[PDB]
Design a protein around this ligand. Sequence first.
Ligand SMILES: *[B@@]1([O])O[C][C]([C][O])O1
Length: 261
Amino acid sequence: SAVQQKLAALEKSSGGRLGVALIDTADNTQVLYRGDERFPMCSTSKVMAAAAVLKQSETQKQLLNQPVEIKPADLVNYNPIAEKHVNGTMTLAELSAAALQYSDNTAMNKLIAQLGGPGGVTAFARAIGDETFRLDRTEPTLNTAIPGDPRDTTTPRAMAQTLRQLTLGHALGETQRAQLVTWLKGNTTGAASIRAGLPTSWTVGDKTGSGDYGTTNDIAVIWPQGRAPLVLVTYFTQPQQNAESRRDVLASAARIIAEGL
Ligand SMILES: *[B@@]1([O])O[C][C]([C][O])O1
């Protein structure tokens, strides 16, 4: 189709490897570009960790208010929110928000610990029908994004389906789903990524990711005004370990998708 020709041209122009999956929930139609190739998730994996904790809170009703101590040894490479609470506590809700809306890596590591390790995050994915997602490492090493390395990867198709289930479907309880949606809509790191290629009137909830090999990712739920929502996953990675981030590619891919509707 036209859209696949334009995405291929965008990829060729970029020098990297682009993966896209769009689900249009109006008719459950899908548009895929390298949809079944693995890509490093980087911080897009934070959505699964937060959702796993939300799932736990369906039974442990006060879990999100549980205080968690932030110690100096907990700080890793990128901790914009946790840094503000060193030698204090943050609740699991605050850690989830920080991981999602600021991409805080300490917060992610606390979520992973709450789940019993990366295997606990992966298990949640399996429990909701995602056979592809795998989380193998903690922060910051899950961002190494080494070509060919299957650790800490998923495919665009899988992540789009899972994001749909978590936000628009019923993989989570009603209060938990709403909380996740609220968190995603409040993301602060996404202005130059998918959002930049979409009409300013559309409501977007997204989670970005960035890593080595110039890996530049964004996953989003999109609520166009007067129109069924869309789920869009855009993954991008490059052949040079020290490549620069290319958020413009994700914006352009979103623009191409949006034009086709
Ligand atoms: B994710 O990908 O978003 C930012 C942090 C930086 O390590 O990880």
